[PDB]
Design a protein around this nucleic acid. Structure first.
Ligand code: MG
Lengths: 213, 100, 36, 229
RNA sequence: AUUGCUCUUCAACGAGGAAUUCCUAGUAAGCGCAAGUCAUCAGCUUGCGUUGAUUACGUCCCUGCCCUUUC
RNA sequence: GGAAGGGCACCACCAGGAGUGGAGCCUGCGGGACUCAACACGGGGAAACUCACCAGGUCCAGACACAAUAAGGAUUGUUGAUUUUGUGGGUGGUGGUGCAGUGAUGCCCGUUCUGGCGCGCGCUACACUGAC
């Protein structure tokens, strides 16, 4: 069965893409990009470094294309830096190209939902916690945190439990976005990790831990 | 004393491991032959590297370079229109175009 | 491992004095054809 | 219980190069990269941005997607194994052009700047660093075989091939040897492009895998197997 | 302006992708010297001389072109 | 049309050596799918769809409380307590938009000028079989 926020009992891998830099600007509304709109964002006063929705597209691509999504054991939540929280239906097949991804995001943010004929992409009311499973463990990706084997971590946790991973799609910033909800922060690899690799890094171990294959 | 791995001469960093002539060539305005002549006037044996140089040798080299004529360095030895042409070319091109 | 950024041009062109010379060659060739 | 070595300070592992063949290393070949340039200024041909032009060339624009190579390079380059200096990347273009990727490079994350780098590389045949000390991207002479290590195992990613465990596979292989993977960057096509070079083809899973996911999934196996962390 | 010399300045280039062209003994290749003798040529044409190789010198198997059957 | 028997060819096989294509110089000839339901799909110069867009120069940032100065004068472009000096001090608010003029209303968050190549030759290098 397709996993949804309504169902809380089933064990699953939750991945929260915190600090997602998705924003629509009309001159028609178009997703702001670091490269497409440099002069405009200079007028807005925001630095172009933190104007990159490409990272979220890359993280979504690897996560949705990851095995566990195919096995029906993964759901993705995206928290926009502006404060917009987005749920991603596991069944979706997001556009592989970024330009078509940008056009999808602007449709989502304005229409608040995407219907093709269960919302594929649905904007939902904060906080994240109410949507998350009732019994679930929360962790963040921290470089400074101790390095832990993702596989060995998952087995030592319970079976009824689910796991939430809060990954920062931000280009640069302090790793305190999800400190308020999380109970402990862990390190995944010894070297610095990009958000996409960390999501790819994490999901493979759960596949090994849960024998998704 | 200790071999000088690097030296500062005329506001330029010269490696010790290079010979004196081919180290002094690094200085702007100093080539291979000019450095050779400066050394020969300074009475420095060329086989020595730059690091073996004593302070007096370096100071004498400095005064050779700064006062060449005073030390008998030979005088022979020591050291809009385009736009108009473009416009004339454009006139040539347009006239030749009018011919064809 | 060490990391070095790649150097590239935003738009590749396969200074003006060379451009001036290039037009001369075309003008030299074009005129010679007309004379012939 | 043991006295520490003379020097414990961590030093950067050597940057693997095609000249060196002895060291055990990871080789990933992004075979069948769809990278083509055409004067409109030269632009890397894209499936979406350019549709009429590739129709004029007569090439199927389904096989006109360089971003698949971009994401595979991105996920592959940023993998910790590359940070450990145990992985070196080759790209075989659909045209037959072989491109050597130095592990030190940092390709742009956005596709638009990535396209600009390919066209510069394909025309100039090489890319120089900002500091101008090494050629990060260089086109090299085919076949791939001469560049590869003298003792090395070759495998491809085949959906139809038996499913294997990457971690168990790498452990059972010898140490002095190396391993080559030939990944199909094509959106859809038959998996015989590396048949001539490879000796046996392996499947990483039953369900279909994306090219980037398979590269990311495979390399995690080496890092766990080799304890790269 | 012209053609030489002196000094200084000191770049790209670390053997070159897909491909492609020529070549069997004084031959490939390297080096210079002379005259610009009605076409062509001006660091280009021609001539002259000096040093001097590897490999093959076998086949119609692939390709191509022929000969004979005054079959 | 077929068949048979022979010969020949660095425009064939075979074995190698030289180049050209990378760099510098010089030079001849020619000028409509969708690993991508939803989006994106006839487009081309960063941006600019008709008064736009891009880059710069002016004007706008006075709530209120207290105290002082102060009518014999604080401040104004000649005026008269509007300000000025010091201490404290709140607010996105000529906001927009969707709903049922009205509503503790859901949602979000400026002004005037000045400029705008394709095909080919030849020579030299990438050194220690070298350079001087
Ligand atoms: Mg013969």
């Amino acid at each position: 069965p397709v996993l949804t926020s309504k169902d809380k009992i089933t064990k699953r891998m939750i991945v929260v893409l915190a600090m997602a830099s998705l924003e629509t600007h009309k001159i028609k509304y178009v997703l702001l990009n670091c490269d497409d709109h440099q002069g405009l964002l200079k007028k807005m006063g925001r630095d172009i470094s933190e104007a990159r929705p490409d990272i979220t597209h890359q993280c979504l691509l690897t996560l949705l294309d990851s095995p566990i999504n195919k096995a029906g054991k993964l759901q993705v939540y995206i928290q926009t830096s502006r404060g917009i929280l987005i749920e991603v239906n596991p069944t979706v097949r997001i556009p592989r190209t970024f330009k078509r991804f940008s056009g999808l995001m602007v449709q989502l943010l304005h229409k608040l939902s995407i219907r093709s004929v269960e919302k594929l992409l649905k904007v939902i009311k904060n906080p994240i916690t109410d949507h998350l499973p009732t019994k679930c463990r929360k962790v963040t990706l921290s470089f400074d945190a101790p390095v832990i084997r993702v596989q060995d971590y998952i087995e030592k946790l319970d079976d009824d439990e689910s796991i939430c991973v809060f990954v920062g799609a931000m280009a640069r910033g302090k790793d305190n976005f999800a400190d308020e909800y999380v109970d402990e922060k862990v390190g995944l690899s010894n070297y610095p990790l990009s958000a996409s690799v960390a999501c790819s890094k994490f999901c493979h171990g759960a596949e090994d831990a849960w024998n998704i294959l | 004393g200790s071999f000088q791995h690097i030296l500062r001469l005329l506001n330029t960093n010269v490696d010790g491991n290079i010979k004196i002539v081919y180290a002094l060539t690094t200085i702007k305005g100093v080539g291979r032959r000019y450095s050779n002549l400066v050394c020969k006037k300074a009475d420095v044996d060329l086989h020595k590297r730059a690091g073996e140089l004593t302070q007096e040798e370096l100071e004498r080299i400095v005064q050779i370079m700064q006062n060449p004529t005073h030390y008998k360095i030979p005088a022979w030895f020591l050291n809009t229109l385009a736009n108009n042409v473009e416009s004339k070319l454009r006139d040539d091109l347009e006239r030749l175009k009018k011919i064809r | 491992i060490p990391t070095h950024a790649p150097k590239y041009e935003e738009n590749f062109n396969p200074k003006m004095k060379a451009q001036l010379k290039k037009e001369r060659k075309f003008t030299m060739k074009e005129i010679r054809k007309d004379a012939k």
